[model samples]
Target: RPSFAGKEYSLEPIDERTPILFQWFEARPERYEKGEVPILNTEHPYLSNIINAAKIENERIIGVLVDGNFTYEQKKEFLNLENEHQNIAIIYRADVDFSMYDKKLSDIYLENIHKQESYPASERDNYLLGLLREELKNIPEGKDSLIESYAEKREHTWFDFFRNLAILKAGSLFTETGNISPCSGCIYLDADMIITDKLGVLYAPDGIAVHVDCNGAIVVNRSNHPALLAGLDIMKSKVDAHPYYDGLGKGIKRHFNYSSLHNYNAFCDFIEEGNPGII
Candidate 1:
């Protein structure tokens, strides 16, 4: 039960696969024990360098701006060299700030999300109490007094409980699909051609990657192909319809317009070349 600016959040007790999550991160914490995960720099050092550099430069854009899938895929496509790794399984990590993806859910209006949900209040209280105890154990030895006082007030009506769940749930449910989940906000690309012009590539929030299990595997890295010049045409329509979209400048903000692909010289060259020898 973490509160922000006098605002407390009520998260839903997961309805499915709670064991899976615990096993992945908490149960087998040793899997990501610092020294194990190999850091991939990529084949095209220049390309890989640029992408990493951009992330560092734009870290302010929100540390977790891109979805796991899109980021992993784009990283793999640019840096994965020598044809060593193909695809890595991944899972979407929740966005910290809903406003990053959905501006309509303004920081000021966010409390409304918690007010609209419905759940069994008694069950919710038990769940929140369980979480509070867990947090109490994690806190420093001297901080137990604070948690003791907080957990004691475990009284919330069903409406109050559900409303809290709904606010946090909105962040999860309202997320954009990626190349993997179009319903969420996935950017689609063909798996046909090699991308030569670096700028020709387009990345949408939908292009992010997912991380799966204790293995730290990423699914986007496995797929290697920048089939189309870009999926900007499709992206444009998505942004235009998005309730949060506020006519931001071109870039990922401008949605794709299929016709743009027809005018893209690189894509047309790819189709006309028919040269199986070309990399």
Candidate 2:
């Protein structure tokens, strides 16, 4: 544990199941054959249900675990078998709703604001805000099939994918409880879809802290519930409003809104004349 703001906090625990499931996932992961993944299918309520879901879909996957009642120790071990199977490297869904990530993050932050004496506007939130102004450069990465559905223009790798998704996963913790510990859900990745090791403090769905500079990132203050931090960044990406500002959230929202809905030339005019921060 380390101290921050005069409080001692525990470091985020590495899920005991990380290496185990990672090794398991590396062994014989498979993909869904044929058409798009069937979204209506919700059979995977447990680990045992995974194979069944695969058998039905002609998919053979290992990583994405279903939302379930399994213990992390039972899921991770204590039983030893599941001991290595927590959310560290595994990918899961929001369980509540996959697309509500932004709002869920926002909602949690609001609740946190009311519950605690200082937050969002605290020293940490401002510190986090500073990191974002420098790190999220708004640089485009060109086209790729990875997050194609997102239609996102930012340039990031599979490793950054890990962190981004991890941040989204932290939102899941909020939806699941005031909330729960570790993580809430995951999605199976096939053997070929590679994930890399990136330099950023990864977040768990439960709650944790971090040190994300422009070049590298790490989680440090463990007790700080991270939903609001995640909320700020995720909402910052969209036109969605948690209605904050280091004096600029609303302006950024309008900028994204104008860029998406207005004529390209006039959008430029806003940047050149209106000076709505940066485009």
Candidate 3:
């Protein structure tokens, strides 16, 4: 346990089941099927039913979780964001073959952002932004296909998706809470998706802390509950922990899993530092 601004924040344990379920909630982005995926209309009754199922499943998470409390407007914003997330999955799976021309567009965006740090900010400004817009105009056709129906020109790609993930991989210190800027589309579990009431900490499968820079506070990503940590402690004492799931310990893995144990532990450890001055 550690103290932050006079308050004690204890670690909570996260079970294997929760992580597996959490992966399911986001459809396992990193491991997402690359082939054709059916377009599930966000406005369809069936889609609504799936969201309801997600809601119910969220209600059943039994562990300590953090509350990234969100406002009404944020909730509305999240619904839209969630739709885009679904769309991303759809795009990845749909049969829309990327023409070399447009595939080059993705490369353009990737290159510009990847090398942005090496270039002067003034020179690197939104040039790729134009590329994104133009590419959005050329989405391939498919079943239920229509470029206008899709939400393209994602500002999030350059902002949250690229930049934030870079920060985590480098083991750098960053904001302590979900308020972190340029995080763009990133939302707290409780705020956007359903969550537990306590915080869970990962100490094993390789005993190390999970890290994340979020909400203006860099903290470990643990179950939001207290009990979970206790369970993890006992479990770790009895089990040998590994560094990360074999072969997939990077941002790419997190992209697939939705919840990266490393990122979570890093974020929690970051927060723990605030209390004990270095745990």
Candidate 4:
């Protein structure tokens, strides 16, 4: 559907199939291993150097910030890229922070993300036991430990079981998107264009290369055509689905304890003022 940033683009249906390539370093521990993901032969030196080379040829390159600490979602996309694209795919292998994009995450938040989520039975048992202790404390203290020692508490009410399950679910679900990214993948097309989840420069024509973050904020990218320039604000508004929020943000926060309330307020301001959103 080309739906993300299209309302503002006078999309000239791509008539020409553009050439593309990838670049990878030889020393990265998790690159193009035999029978592994990103299974493509690659060339090294520098991706920046290649972008310059492609720019000289009036072409564009898709760049992936490969940090070797890919999440499960990232690995799935990597394998998808491997079997799908037929090119000597070379990606930039380097350490990068999500802040390089438009993301602002706390150190602990990111550390926990890099550490895969856990929902061990031990934790659940502890949670149940802690709550049980609270209930048992109401048993006049004496002999409360007697019932606590017995394991027949497994014959509990469904309400408590469901409550515990929801807590566990919310713990995993209230995550910010792109928590494992900026180290993502890409798909380039038509020599002039590249698609990636990693934030990078977009080589629009007419001596201007705009920086488009993976969050899909386009300071100006896609093409240097006059149509795009005229509809820059329109594109921004369309791209930022949040700016037009009515109740969804509030609903999310109320339901899941989603933690982007400040951002939601900012977008509300953008909407109220009829402001062309920030690039």
Candidate 5:
């Protein structure tokens, strides 16, 4: 446990039966996926059903886990959810390697903002502001240039992914929780998943619970929940045991599966339901 702002935050223990689920992004970038469309609908029915389930249940705290460069519309839709029952926390994605792009964008944005005495009003919103747009306004030429640079410097390996898993899995602890963020008991979902019913099944008493989907897309746990931390500790152990599930460590291959497989099977066995096998 650590103290922040004169308050001590507690770490939860991990339960063998129930595991916590968390998502980094709705889906990988199109380029990363080689432009393959896994889900039929771009509107992503699964993503909606997941979100709606939380709303129907009137969940207290909901964490909207997302990667960097989320659209303005996405921020608005989540910020202005129809259900007032739940408090939303916008957690940034940590799995992917976007350091170079992040630094470049940050540098450009600062330089652009420096052009104006008062911070550009447009910068207040989530979307790319005036200077950001101007910086990358060279059509396919600029796009290719950025992608080339990203490929050159980006280190998309199992090691970084493992580190990121720990980062996002432990939410609110490092992100700073307050009036806007939930202190405990929050359900996490990806931006693309759709919800149409209640998600009470996700509730876990002994520890955190998770759905055995891609990267455990549907994760439910309380804020500063002890089980959440414990589960993460267990996950780290599994990763350390199977450092290279697949022959190479380039992208999210078997590492994601091997790291998550043991917990998924254990949770399924404990519940006596849900698919125990990996995808």
Candidate 6:
């Protein structure tokens, strides 16, 4: 359980597989230990870099300026400003190198079992978690549990629970009224494309749209807009449809694709609006 601003969150209960995901990091505290996760603040180097980088890429970038990086005065200025800047969307990240692709490393130890094909994209996460839990049970503790040791190590562990908390915080802010500007838009984008002009490629004629870049980017126009909000609701239903298992059947491939579903389906929700396609 985690809390924010004195109020605690009631996260959905997870199965044994979910705990195993945490074990991959918690078991190796000697290498991947948790440090101070960045709060949304102006002084943080990572967030500052994201804003600076976005400024170089997009002409008008909107952000959730509630707490972390912006001061009261700075937030006012951002809200009062009329025009949009490119790539200005503010996204927070965990300090450690817990990349989505890193889950691929777990393949060597996971069992060679296929998830029930009938599982919807929404439930796929839990299904894979079960697979992970089953495999972890077979191995002796501490033998291969220190999976991330071989990579260029940094903090004590690879898991950043704090990062997930920040994400939950941001999502809550976007959903709550009065937390951000009426015209403000908040989204998630990968570091690579986010630093480039690719953000300009997503646009809608009605000035209300959400765009998903297949490469890993989501653009929501006016977080308070009806279309975007409706799209968000639609996205929840499509969540389970994203791919979680890769290298399935026969040879049983050694890769896991986890980031595909949420981003892609959110885009699907936005595009369903009778709006023009991404320009």
Q: TM-score of each candidate?
A: 0.18, 0.27, 0.20, 0.20, 0.37, 0.27
Angstrom error of the Cα, residue 81, model 4: value is 18
Candidate 5 lDDT, tens digit per residue, 68-170? Answer: 3345555454455524434434445443333322223233345454544355566464343454455545323444332233333333433323333333334
**Which parts of model 6 are misplaced by more than 4 Å?**
1-180, 194-203, 208-214, 231-279
Please write out the lDDT profile of model 4 over residues 1-279, one tens digit for every residue: 111111221222211122223323222435444444442333422433334334443432323333334446546766565345423233322222112112111222333333323445554455444544444345433332221221123222221211111112211211221111221112222122333322233232221112221111111112222322222222122212221131122222223232433354433322121112111
lDDT of each: 0.24, 0.30, 0.27, 0.28, 0.36, 0.30
lDDT of 6 by residue, 186-274 (tens): 34333222243333333432322222222233333332333332322222222121121111100011111213333445334433222
Which 10-residue span in candidate 2 carries the lowest summed lDDT? 19-28
Which has the higher TM-score value, candidate number 1 or candidate number 3? 3
lDDT of 2 by residue, 1-279 (tens): 333223343434423122111112111112322331211222332333333333332221223422223333333332232234322223333232334333332333444434442454444465444444433343234421223323232232222333344433442433343222344322222222222221122223223322221112222122123433443354434422222231122332232343344454543322221111101
Q: Write model 1 residue lDDT over 1-279, tens digit each, in one string.
A: 422223333321211111011001112223232432222223424223323322322211111121222333344532342132222222223333222222221221222223322345744555544543454355544433321222223232211211111222222322332212112221111112232322212222222221211011111111111211022222222322211122111221222222433443422221221212112
Q: Give the top-scoring candidate (TM-score).
A: 5
- What is the Å distance of residue 216 in model 1 from its true position? 21
- What is the lDDT ranking, best to worst? 5, 6, 2, 4, 3, 1
Worst 10 residues of 1 by lDDT: 16-25
Worst 10 residues of 6 by lDDT: 14-23
Q: Name the regions of candidate 5 deviating beyond 4 angstroms.
A: 1-43, 71-88, 94-196, 199-205, 213-267, 271-279
lDDT of 3 at 257: 33
Between candidates 1 and 5, the one scoring higher on TM-score is 5
The parts of candidate 3 lying over 4 Å away from their true place are 20-153, 157-210, 214-269, 272-279
Query: Over the full model, what C-alpha lDDT does candidate 4 score relative to the true structure?
Result: 0.28
C-alpha lDDT of candidate 6 relative to the true structure: 0.30
Candidate 4's displacement at residue 232, Å, is 18
**Which is the winner by TM-score between candidate 2 and candidate 3?**
2
